[PDB]
From Swiss-Prot:
A motif (9aaTAD) lies at residues 236-244. The gene is PPARG. Rosiglitazone binds at Q63, F64, R65, S66, H100, H226, Y242. Highest expression in adipose tissue. Lower in skeletal muscle, spleen, heart and liver. Also detectable in placenta, lung and ovary. The chain holds residues 235 to 505 of 505 of the full protein. Nuclear receptor that binds peroxisome proliferators such as hypolipidemic drugs and fatty acids. Once activated by a ligand, the nuclear receptor binds to DNA specific PPAR response elements (PPRE) and modulates the transcription of its target genes, such as acyl-CoA oxidase. It therefore controls the peroxisomal beta-oxidation pathway of fatty acids. Key regulator of adipocyte differentiation and glucose homeostasis. ARF6 acts as a key regulator of the tissue-specific adipocyte P2 (aP2) enhancer. It is found in: Nucleus; Cytoplasm. Changing R65H: In colon cancer; sporadic; somatic mutation; partial loss of ligand-binding. The 9aaTAD motif is a transactivation domain present in a large number of yeast and animal transcription factors. Interacts with FOXO1 (acetylated form). Heterodimer with other nuclear receptors, such as RXRA. The heterodimer with the retinoic acid receptor RXRA is called adipocyte-specific transcription factor ARF6. Interacts with NCOA6 coactivator, leading to a strong increase in transcription of target genes. Interacts with coactivator PPARBP, leading to a mild increase in transcription of target genes. Interacts with NOCA7 in a ligand-inducible manner. Interacts with NCOA1 and NCOA2 LXXLL motifs. Interacts with ASXL1, ASXL2, DNTTIP2, FAM120B, MAP2K1/MEK1, NR0B2, PDPK1, PRDM16, PRMT2 and TGFB1I1. Induction: (Microbial infection) Expression increases when incubated with M.tuberculosis or its lipoprotein LpqH; induction is TLR2-dependent (at protein level). Phosphorylated in basal conditions and dephosphorylated when treated with the ligand. May be dephosphorylated by PPP5C. This is Peroxisome proliferator-activated receptor gamma. It is linked to Defects in PPARG can lead to type 2 insulin-resistant diabetes and hyptertension. PPARG mutations may be associated with colon cancer. Obesity: A condition characterized by an increase of body weight beyond the limitation of skeletal and physical requirements, as the result of excessive accumulation of body fat.
């Protein structure tokens, strides 16, 4: 069992490395100096557009990048053992209600308190420049930075995140699922793999597993806040997902 749980953890990490171009390990090395173009004002944004309405151009740009993120997450989900054996309507339902929770978890790997890496680490857009965008675009990334600073304090690595992301995807309580029991059976196995992984990898963080379970609830609140903010404000694929999260 435990040996199988370590094998499951390794399989997920290997697929995680392949499905996502910029891992947290590489992101933190770029963020700490171990090089991206810094966008900190209107002048550097225009310079960076040449090197790599303004508020609408930014929002539409990340709208396309989020759709590409959905593609990467879908590729990773299909590598989770047992996922492709689920009914295709359940695979689509799990992805539709979970991709944004995954996007914000992985986005945290690209952020610090000062800004976020963009374009596969080629750029770095500051948190305060994003806040300077006209309303309502100036508050569109702020809740994500707030979550990331606290989430990053847990100091998870890529091997932890690969299992954590799989746990979120295999949520048996998404609306419209046909066969809840096989999804819950996979998640329980993933949850045991995650608990074993955190115990081995974080010998000085005794309550890390419990804190991560609470983060999964926080992510649902971030998504709810995000779709409400988007109701006040569009890519046709995202509208398909948003129509069911409103
Ligand atoms: O290309 C990417 O993957 C990206 F850089 F992440 C982005 F999604 F395009 C972006 F984050 F929205 C971006 F970088 F901000 C931007 F390119 F859209 C922009 F804002 F710089 C511009 F003005 F080009 F749209
Ligand atoms: O680093 C980037 O290139 C990026 F665009 F910021 C992103 F990380 F890909 C991103 F997470 F997809 C995002 F665009 F920031 C976003 F998806 F979080 C969003 F802000 F667009 C959404 F609207 F989805 F929250
Ligand atoms: O609108 C539909 O009829 C649809 F096919 F269900 C869908 F909305 F496109 C969707 F499949 F849910 C989806 F949003 F595109 C999806 F995200 F689930 C996905 F299947 F396309 C992806 F693969 F991206 F997860």
């Amino acid at each position: 069992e435990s040996a199988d749980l370590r094998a499951l953890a390794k399989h997920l990490y290997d697929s995680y490395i392949k499905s996502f171009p910029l891992t947290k390990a590489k992101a933190r090395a770029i963020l700490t100096g171990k090089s991206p173009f810094v966008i900190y004002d209107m002048n550097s944004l225009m310079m960076g557009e040449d090197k790599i309405e303004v508020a609408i151009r930014i929002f539409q740009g990340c709208q396309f990048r989020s759709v590409e993120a959905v593609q990467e997450i879908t590729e990773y989900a299909k590598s989770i053992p047992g996922f492709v054996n689920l009914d295709l309507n359940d695979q689509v339902t799990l992805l539709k209600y979970g991709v944004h929770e995954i996007i914000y978890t992985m986005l945290a790997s690209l952020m610090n308190k000062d800004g976020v890496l963009i374009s596969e680490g080629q750029g770095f857009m500051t948190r305060e420049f994003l806040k300077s965008l006209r309303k309502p675009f100036g508050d569109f990334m702020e809740p994500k930075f707030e979550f990331a600073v606290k989430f990053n304090a847990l100091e998870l690595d890529d091997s932890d995140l690969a299992i954590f992301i799989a746990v979120i995807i295999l949520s048996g309580d998404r609306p419209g699922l046909l066969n809840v029991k096989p999804i819950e059976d996979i998640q329980d196995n993933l949850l045991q793999a995650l608990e074993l992984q955190l115990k081995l990898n974080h010998p000085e963080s005794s309550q890390l597993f419990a804190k991560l379970l609470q983060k999964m609830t926080d992510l649902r609140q971030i998504v709810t806040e995000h779709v409400q903010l988007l109701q006040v404000i569009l890519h046709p694929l995202l509208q398909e997902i948003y129509k069911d999260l409103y």
